[PDB]
Amino acid sequence: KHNMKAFLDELKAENIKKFLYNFTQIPHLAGTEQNFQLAKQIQSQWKEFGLDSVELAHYDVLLSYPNKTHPNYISIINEDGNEIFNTSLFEPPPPGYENVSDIVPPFSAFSPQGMPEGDLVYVNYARTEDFFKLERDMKINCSGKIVIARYGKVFRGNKVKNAQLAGAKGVILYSDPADYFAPGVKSYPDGWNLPGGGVQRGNILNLNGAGDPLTPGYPANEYAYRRGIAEAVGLPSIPVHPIGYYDAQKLLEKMGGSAPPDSSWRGSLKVPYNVGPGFTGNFSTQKVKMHIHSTNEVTRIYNVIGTLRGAVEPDRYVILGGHRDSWVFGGIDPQSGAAVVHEIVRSFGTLKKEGWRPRRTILFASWDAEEFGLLGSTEWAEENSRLLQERGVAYINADSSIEGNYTLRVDCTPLMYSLVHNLTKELKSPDEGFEGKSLYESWTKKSPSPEFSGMPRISKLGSGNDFEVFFQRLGIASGRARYTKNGYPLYHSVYETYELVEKFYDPMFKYHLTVAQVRGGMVFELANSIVLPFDCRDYAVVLRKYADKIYSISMKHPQEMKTYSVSFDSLFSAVKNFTEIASKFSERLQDFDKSNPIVLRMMNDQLMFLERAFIDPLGLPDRPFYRHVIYAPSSHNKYAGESFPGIYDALFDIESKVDPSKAWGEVKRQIYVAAFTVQAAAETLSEVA
Amino acid sequence: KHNMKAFLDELKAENIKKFLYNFTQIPHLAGTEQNFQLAKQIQSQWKEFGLDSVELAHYDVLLSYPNKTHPNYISIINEDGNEIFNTSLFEPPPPGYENVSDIVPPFSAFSPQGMPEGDLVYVNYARTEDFFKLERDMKINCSGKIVIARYGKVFRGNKVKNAQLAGAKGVILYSDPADYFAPGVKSYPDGWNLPGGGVQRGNILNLNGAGDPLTPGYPANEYAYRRGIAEAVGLPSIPVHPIGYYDAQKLLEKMGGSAPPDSSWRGSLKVPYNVGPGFTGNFSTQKVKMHIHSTNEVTRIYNVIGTLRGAVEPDRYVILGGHRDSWVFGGIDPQSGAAVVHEIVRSFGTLKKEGWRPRRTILFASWDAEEFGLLGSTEWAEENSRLLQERGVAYINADSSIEGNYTLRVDCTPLMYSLVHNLTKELKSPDEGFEGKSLYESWTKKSPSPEFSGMPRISKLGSGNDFEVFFQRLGIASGRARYTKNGYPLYHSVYETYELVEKFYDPMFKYHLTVAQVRGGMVFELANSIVLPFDCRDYAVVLRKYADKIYSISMKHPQEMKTYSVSFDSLFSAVKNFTEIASKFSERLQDFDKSNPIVLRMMNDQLMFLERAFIDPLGLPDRPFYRHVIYAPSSHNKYAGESFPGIYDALFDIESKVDPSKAWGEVKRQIYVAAFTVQAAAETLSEVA
Ligand SMILES: *[C@@H]1O[C@H](CO)[C@@H](O[C@@H]2O[C@H](CO)[C@@H](O[C@@H]3O[C@H](CO)[C@@H](O)[C@H](O[C@H]4O[C@H](CO)[C@@H](O)[C@H](O)[C@@H]4O)[C@@H]3O)[C@H](O)[C@H]2NC(C)=O)[C@H](O)[C@H]1NC(C)=O
Ligand SMILES: *[C@@H]1O[C@H](CO)[C@@H](O[C@@H]2O[C@H](CO)[C@@H](O[C@@H]3O[C@H](CO)[C@@H](O)[C@H](O[C@H]4O[C@H](CO)[C@@H](O)[C@H](O)[C@@H]4O)[C@@H]3O)[C@H](O)[C@H]2NC(C)=O)[C@H](O)[C@H]1NC(C)=O
Ligand SMILES: CC(=O)NCCOc1cc(Br)ccc1C(=O)NCCCC[C@H](NC(=O)N[C@@H](CCC(=O)O)C(=O)O)C(=O)O
Ligand SMILES: CC(=O)NCCOc1cc(Br)ccc1C(=O)NCCCC[C@H](NC(=O)N[C@@H](CCC(=O)O)C(=O)O)C(=O)O
Ligand SMILES: *[C@@H]1O[C@H](CO)[C@@H](O[C@@H]2O[C@H](CO)[C@@H](O)[C@H](O)[C@H]2NC(C)=O)[C@H](O)[C@H]1NC(C)=O
Ligand SMILES: *[C@@H]1O[C@H](CO)[C@@H](O[C@@H]2O[C@H](CO)[C@@H](O)[C@H](O)[C@H]2NC(C)=O)[C@H](O)[C@H]1NC(C)=O
Ligand SMILES: *[C@@H]1O[C@H](CO)[C@@H](O[C@@H]2O[C@H](CO)[C@@H](O)[C@H](O)[C@H]2NC(C)=O)[C@H](O)[C@H]1NC(C)=O
Ligand SMILES: *[C@@H]1O[C@H](CO)[C@@H](O[C@@H]2O[C@H](CO)[C@@H](O)[C@H](O)[C@H]2NC(C)=O)[C@H](O)[C@H]1NC(C)=O
Ligand SMILES: *[C@@H]1O[C@H](CO)[C@@H](O[C@@H]2O[C@H](CO)[C@@H](O)[C@H](O)[C@H]2NC(C)=O)[C@H](O)[C@H]1NC(C)=O
Ligand SMILES: *[C@@H]1O[C@H](CO)[C@@H](O[C@@H]2O[C@H](CO)[C@@H](O)[C@H](O)[C@H]2NC(C)=O)[C@H](O)[C@H]1NC(C)=O
Ligand SMILES: *[C@@H]1O[C@H](CO)[C@@H](O)[C@H](O)[C@H]1NC(C)=O
Ligand SMILES: *[C@@H]1O[C@H](CO)[C@@H](O)[C@H](O)[C@H]1NC(C)=O
Ligand SMILES: *[C@@H]1O[C@H](CO)[C@@H](O)[C@H](O)[C@H]1NC(C)=O
Ligand SMILES: *[C@@H]1O[C@H](CO)[C@@H](O)[C@H](O)[C@H]1NC(C)=O
Ligand SMILES: *[C@@H]1O[C@H](CO)[C@@H](O)[C@H](O)[C@H]1NC(C)=O
Ligand SMILES: *[C@@H]1O[C@H](CO)[C@@H](O)[C@H](O)[C@H]1NC(C)=O
Ligand SMILES: [Ca+2]
Ligand SMILES: [Ca+2]
Ligand SMILES: [Cl-]
Ligand SMILES: [Cl-]
Ligand SMILES: [Zn+2]
Ligand SMILES: [Zn+2]
Ligand SMILES: [Zn+2]
Ligand SMILES: [Zn+2]
């Protein structure tokens, strides 16, 4: 039989290991020759593996790179202007890679150039609430200061935006052992912790879904018109640079001014964690000076796009996509995901060579420049948005397969909750102590949902990965899955290597195999079930949960809700209707006449277009590329999802707005928008005529 | 047989006559009780005629009405402030209707209130070029003046916008016999001309597709949040009022200042047509004073929505829609169209009662508040946009069936050119002298296309009617057809009556019948052809024509095109590709395996979504509701279509821009957008996998 079991059994742990090793011996930084070579290899092998076509799609996008002859670094500088202390120019490379060239030194991609000099303020995680505390409660003013912030909690682009809005003239990011050194574990190479010389690379953009900073809306193709840098989307206006905790200790140890406000502001280094501004009295005339010389350059990138034509509905696309570019070796990020995809392709190709075809078309992607802002996926989607809007069934992401070795992590649309439950009950747990039990059982035991007894946690989609264009811009049902912990310390560091994975995360490649089965399994089902495997009722349940949640936030302001006549009735009414209509649609989907293919196509179209129905073509306020009304990335933390984001942001900090009538007006406006869109989505599930 | 001939033969001229008479005995002004009653009648009869369901869909939208106890009028006022001349307060009503109540007096809907007083400037048709001539060449300054303009050439909303941007403090519109009195024909009731006391009502909004001024984007339903009037879309900021040529003569006869610049500025009244400002010396101290007291009011409107469920593809909608609201009696506008629709419904219902059903679902609409800005169609589309985006095959408009009695007029998407040619060859010409000949033959003889010998003129869609939301916002293939002349004088006047039509336009109701066959025929084919009756190749042909046209406009500026590197190569390349791909798609559509319904559905979806592919979700600059990249209403004349409007407006008057680098940049940007969208549309016709 050519069925799911056949697909699943052909997947091999040993294969994923061979591929991971192959993809991680040299760096594959976006826009470099080495990453072009790997694209060409992936393209050749997918062809050999059996796909019907395999093409490269290229774009010319804004990237950022340090100047090789003018390195970036930070100094403590004395009253004379002598640099008495300099941060490191490179991470000590790991054992056996000390002769690898083209390791990009740590830097914050897209930082502008500058050499600002000033007093430090320490801002904790540089979260919205950290700055509120500092400005509102402690009365510290960051204007003209250099801020230093510890990585963690929220996306680093949000930190930089927040610093910049507080009037900082520069930002220093560092990795605190409180957040990146697990108790009892040793530093790389002897365990999986971050050494003091390790540093986290990463871009610091605020793109809000735009893709290439220069070409919002349109693909960065050969004849594209580009904005000038001054009008580019999402670039920071102040220099930024990341450092490790050895160097951070040197910058923090002399800090003076106010004490930290409380213990949630103290990391684990042996320093007081004073907020500043500036240093204690003896050094009060020493300053910090950054030297940043990175340049932004339009550079060509390459996606690989593989097609496995569907037998019955070739005009219906199930997409498995993940990126290929890495900061350095990409041992976990992305290559642990890409090796999984490569084996998935191999297994689908095996079946195809024996004469099978999926029912719908499967598209496989190896995206470029994900690290620089999801640029490769976003540009390709901009190019192909019409095809995707009308034909896109689903998108399954495939970045890192592991960030830990404890249990499964799934984030996805409610429309895939049932699919994930059902598949995971049919898969074997790889976990110690659950030999012969199902993945559902182990996952449910170790990660119980907060809401329902006997079910597992499934999170909403956030962002900071390549599903963003598909889900939040285009409204294609999306999901992702990986093994996780109970981020990871070596994230975006030179120390993320093949050996890190083989020695410390997954020596048997069993967690990888489990992830390939979940991802692959999802795609197989999406691509081959006669009836699309979405359950609209699961949306109805979460919609009520989110409505209760947003209502409760509003209800912290009972007096304003009275004064301005703020009602959530319309939104609850819409959610009720969606629940009733969804229930009747499910009955029909169960009871409809199974022989009739138009009836079948009608009802699958209704399932496919349900996610699509949550898109507002007007987008969210000031964020035109975030069009989904139910889910957007948090305005405060790009990684986290926010539900009813339009209402959430209208309510956020509302007690501070100077014109409350106007602010509450806008809350009511967002309620109207959301109720309307919920009702409109429900109506797509009504009988059609 | 239940085929098109059966549908077509059941249509009767005598039926349309009975309905026209029924729909035109009392006024049906939007938002009034009488128009609600007619909606309820139409709903009852469509039910009786056989439709599967017939519902009212209501909205609460901004309308405008004069104050019944405080009438609007204009005065010449002397140095003392005595009103020595007053324009009329009502049109003399026609014979036999002098006791009809609730005839709304002439007014410009949505005018703000005011009583400005000043000197007149006469601005011809108040076109963009009229104001250029006045300001640039004649050096007359309209700032603080009251402008008087003759109706004609362009939509009146554009006139008012233009006046307002020139700094006018009020506008007076009038009907010049040069434009509204045909030589040799008598005034109503003795012929079809406009009497001197006749006046053209009409709204003066600049909505740019928005619908209800208060709820852009979203339906004006029960829980809608509304903008405040100050933030409403499209309202004029200066008072406006329309008058007839008796009154206009009194205002113009004393005009002084400069002579008219040339004869294209002179109408047919016995006045010099001086431009002003102000009156000749003896009266130089007399002024003009307007008194406008109209109010904007949120008012309920009612669309009637009839459904005839499809037998095979019920989730595919062919829409026949036209409005029901009228300024007064609506003898031509709209009721000559609505009576045609009513008979179409009757004929489809006849067949249905004998057991037939169309292949696809047919939706019939009787729209409200079209006269106030296409509000009823736009709000319903906003409500149902998701259903329409994914299911809408086509929209056939059905406003006035006649504006003359000479030949056919068709404006539509290229995708319907072949359909219209083929249908018209099968229909009988109603024309004198073409007894026994086809409508194609008479139409082709009297209205030859400018491009192709042996073919008829088919125009692009403009706007100023209820297809705008469907075509230019949503990208649903749209068309319209009526009998026309070789506008009409009594347009939007009290004199537009049943008798005007029965006595002077169409006594035998044969032109009406022909129009019902064309409209009905189109819908029948769209709704019942196995393969959708669109020919993508016809788009390819016009796309090249428009590209040649826009290139030629640019080429008036050869030196700037050199300096700024302005190339149209990408756009021509895209048009070439569309031509090649369209040709290959047509071969497949001809040669594909006819038995396979998914292949059929795939290919019909590709045809349905082709029009859809020209939509940019970002819209045109500053006009977010005009999203079609090939067609928008002219920024200078809402009635006229413009091709490649983004490039056209970037080029318009470019020699006047102070920063030519920036202006030419934006031209190149619009070229990129257009080439991209053309290529993207073409790619939807490529094999899908
Ligand atoms: C969820 O689904 C339910 C239907 O199962 C749906 O109910 C609809 O509610 C609207 C109002 O929110 C109803 O609107 C009314 O329609 C009647 C005509 O049928 C009007 O007369 C009513 O207007 C009068 O009364 C109003 C109420 O005080 C006044 O403000 C107004 O000025 C008029 O006096 C009113 O417009 C509608 O009829 C029902 N539809 C049905 C089929 O029951 C509900 O709207 C859906 N929820 C959402 C969020 O869409
Ligand atoms: C209409 O359809 C035709 C195809 O039938 C399509 O042609 C495509 O044109 C683009 C360029 O406009 C080609 O792009 C090239 O791709 C190759 C890789 O295949 C690149 O090496 C090229 O880049 C190099 O050369 C450029 C040209 O001077 C340099 O600017 C660049 O820096 C590099 O040195 C270039 O990107 C593309 O390959 C073809 N595709 C095919 C299948 O022929 C045309 O684009 C379509 N028209 C529109 C408007 O889309
Ligand atoms: C390790 C850490 O600091 N974590 C902070 C907090 O993380 C979360 C917080 C909440 Br609340 C909810 C969820 C998360 C979360 O899922 N974090 C994952 C961090 C790993 C990011 C990883 N992505 C990427 O590295 N993308 C790139 C580019 C992203 C972009 O340009 O948009 C980048 O992020 O620089 C990946 O998705 O695997
Ligand atoms: C009679 C006249 O003055 N004609 C001027 C020039 O007309 C044209 C010019 C060119 Br160039 C190209 C086409 C035309 C044209 O087709 N004109 C038709 C005038 C009749 C308008 C008629 N519509 C309507 O009355 N609509 C309403 C509401 C429209 C809105 O709010 O958007 C209004 O327009 O007040 C109708 O479509 O039948
Ligand atoms: C990764 O694996 C690929 C393919 O198995 C290796 O690429 C092959 O390299 C040899 C040159 O030694 C050639 O004979 C083949 O043409 C290559 N094939 C392709 C498709 O590129 C590659 O060398 C491996 N890389 C590492 C680091 O092990
Ligand atoms: C920090 O690095 C800077 C730059 O390399 C060092 O300062 C330079 O040192 C040489 C003296 O060897 C001078 O010629 C340059 O003028 C210095 N440049 C600047 C900008 O100061 C500095 O010595 C290093 N500091 C430490 C502690 O190593
Ligand atoms: C997950 O599995 C459940 C249980 O098999 C599926 O629900 C069943 O579906 C069948 C076929 O329609 C119904 O007749 C049974 O009544 C259902 N049982 C229950 C308890 O609902 C469910 O459809 C699967 N989900 C997906 C997306 O496939
Ligand atoms: C327009 O035609 C309709 C229907 O033929 C007339 O409406 C009918 O009016 C009588 C009252 O005289 C009732 O018996 C019916 O209930 C009505 N039917 C409907 C569906 O409304 C209407 O009177 C005609 N109007 C004019 C001006 O002739
Ligand atoms: C134009 O209409 C105005 C307003 O009706 C007339 O002026 C009014 O006339 C009466 C005298 O009968 C006065 O009491 C009002 O004070 C006048 N109002 C204003 C605003 O002037 C005027 O007489 C009419 N002019 C002509 C020529 O008929
Ligand atoms: C208009 O009529 C023409 C002529 O009948 C149609 O074109 C023919 O279509 C048949 C069926 O596919 C082809 O086999 C013939 O070769 C076509 N003839 C020509 C000259 O093209 C055309 O399809 C009709 N247009 C529409 C929209 O139906
Ligand atoms: C890098 O720095 C060097 C040397 O100090 C300089 O000459 C060069 O212009 C810079 N390179 C870039 C790409 O800016
Ligand atoms: C913060 O500091 C700068 C001092 O130069 C000042 O311009 C700004 O107003 C200050 N803001 C507050 C709230 O104190
Ligand atoms: C692998 O699993 C063991 C057992 O719990 C755990 O203690 C170890 O920390 C895990 N490795 C990683 C990298 O999390
Ligand atoms: C109309 O004018 C009258 C009388 O001069 C006034 O009292 C009334 O308020 C106005 N009506 C409206 C709706 O504005
Ligand atoms: C037009 O007239 C007004 C006079 O009050 C003036 O303010 C404006 O600048 C003038 N414009 C030109 C171009 O003369
Ligand atoms: C009806 O047709 C005749 C014959 O050409 C024409 O002279 C007359 O003007 C037409 N009526 C109208 C209203 O155009
Ligand atoms: Ca782009
Ligand atoms: Ca609206
Ligand atoms: Cl992932
Ligand atoms: Cl029409
Ligand atoms: Zn990654
Ligand atoms: Zn990453
Ligand atoms: Zn009309
Ligand atoms: Zn009209």
UniProtKB/Swiss-Prot annotation, chains A, B:
| Induction data | In the prostate, up-regulated in response to androgen deprivation.
Q: What is the relationship between pH and activity here?
A: Stable at pH greater than 6.5.
Q: What is the membrane topology noted in the UniProt record heading this document?
A: Single-pass type II membrane protein
Membrane side Extracellular: residue ranges: 1-689
Impact when changing E371 to Q/D:
Complete loss of activity
Gene Ontology, cellular component aspect: cell surface; cytoplasm; extracellular exosome; membrane; plasma membrane
User: Which residues make up the binding site for Zn(2+) 1?
Assistant: H323, D333, D399
Compartments it resides in: Cell membrane
Cite the EC number. Answer: 3.4.17.21
Record keywords: Calcium, Carboxypeptidase, Cell membrane, Cytoplasm, Dipeptidase, Glycoprotein, Hydrolase, Membrane, Metal-binding, Metalloprotease, Multifunctional enzyme, Phosphoprotein, Protease, Signal-anchor, Transmembrane, Transmembrane helix, Zinc
State the name under which the record lists this protein. Answer: Glutamate carboxypeptidase 2
Specify the species.
Homo sapiens
